[PDB]
C-alpha cells in the first residue's frame, strides 16, 4: 500500500569510466573490466519541497511560458 510517508526510490547512475576519483563504495569485488568504474546507487529517501521553493516555481509558472520542447497548448 501507498504508505503516505513521501519516501520514494532515489537512483544515482554513475558512468564514471576514466574518472580520476577512485571508486571506494562497492562491496562485491571486481569484474576486471569497465564495470569497476561504474555504479548504480539506490536509496529510499523522503521527497520534500519547501514552501519557499514552491513560491519560486509559481512565479515562473504564472506567466504561461514554456521550454523549447513540446507544443504550446496554453490558451492564456
Amino acid at each position: 500500500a501507498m504508505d503516505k510517508s513521501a519516501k520514494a526510490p532515489q537512483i544515482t547512475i554513475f558512468d564514471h569510466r576514466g574518472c580520476s576519483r577512485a571508486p571506494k563504495e562497492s562491496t562485491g569485488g571486481k569484474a576486471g573490466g569497465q564495470d569497476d568504474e561504474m555504479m548504480v546507487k539506490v536509496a529510499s529517501t523522503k521527497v520534500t519541497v519547501s514552501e519557499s521553493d514552491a513560491a519560486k516555481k509559481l512565479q515562473e509558472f504564472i506567466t504561461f511560458e514554456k521550454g523549447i520542447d513540446g507544443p504550446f497548448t496554453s490558451k492564456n
Binding site: 573490466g33 564495470d35 548504480v40 514552501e51 514552491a54 516555481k57 504561461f64
Partner: protein
C-alpha cells in the same frame, strides 16, 4: 535483492556486472534510466507548468495548487511518481510501483480533492518527456551514446506511466 531491501545500496564492479545479467538489455536500460533521472527536475517542472498553463484555475484561489503549501505537495508528488516509474524501469518490473506508489493512491486523492483530470495531464506530460529522453530526442541530448534502437525500453517506460494513469484517473 539489494535494491529490494532498500526500497543505500551501492552496486558497482562485479555486483553491477551481476545486476545486468538479471535485467533485460542491461546497458541500454541503465542509459534509459539515467536519461530520465538526471533530467527529473525539468521533467517535473515542465509537467506541472504545462498542467497549469492548460488550466490556470489550478492556481486561482479555488484551485488545488493554490498556496505555496499545496504547490509544494504537488511538485513533490510529481517527483515521487517519476521516481517510482524510474525505479520500475531500473528493476524491469512494476511490482514496487504498484504496491508502494499506486495501491491506495486514488482513494487518497479522492479524499483530498486532488483533481484527477489535472493529475492525469501532469502524468501524461511526464510520459512524453520520458519517452523522448529514452530515445534521446529531447531538446537537451546526451552526446556520446552508442547508436541503436531503444524503442523497446521506451515502450516499457510508457507502460509504467500508463499504470499510473489507470490508477489515478
Amino acid at each position: 535483492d539489494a535494491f529490494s531491501r532498500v526500497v543505500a545500496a551501492y552496486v558497482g564492479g562485479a555486483d553491477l556486472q551481476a545486476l545486468k545479467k538479471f535485467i533485460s538489455e542491461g546497458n541500454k536500460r541503465l542509459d534509459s534510466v539515467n536519461s530520465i533521472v538526471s533530467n527529473a527536475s525539468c521533467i517535473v517542472s515542465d509537467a506541472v507548468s504545462g498542467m497549469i498553463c492548460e488550466n490556470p484555475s489550478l492556481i486561482s484561489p479555488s484551485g488545488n495548487c493554490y498556496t505555496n503549501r499545496r504547490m509544494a505537495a504537488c511538485l513533490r508528488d510529481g517527483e515521487i511518481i517519476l521516481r517510482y516509474v524510474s525505479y520500475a524501469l531500473l528493476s524491469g518490473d512494476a511490482s514496487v510501483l504498484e504496491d508502494r506508489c499506486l495501491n491506495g493512491l486514488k482513494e487518497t486523492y479522492s479524499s483530498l480533492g486532488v483533481p484527477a483530470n489535472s493529475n492525469a495531464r501532469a502524468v501524461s506530460i511526464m510520459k512524453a518527456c520520458a519517452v523522448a529522453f529514452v530515445n534521446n530526442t529531447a531538446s537537451q541530448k546526451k552526446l556520446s551514446t552508442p547508436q541503436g534502437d531503444c524503442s523497446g525500453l521506451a515502450s516499457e517506460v510508457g507502460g509504467y506511466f500508463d499504470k499510473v494513469t489507470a490508477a489515478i484517473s
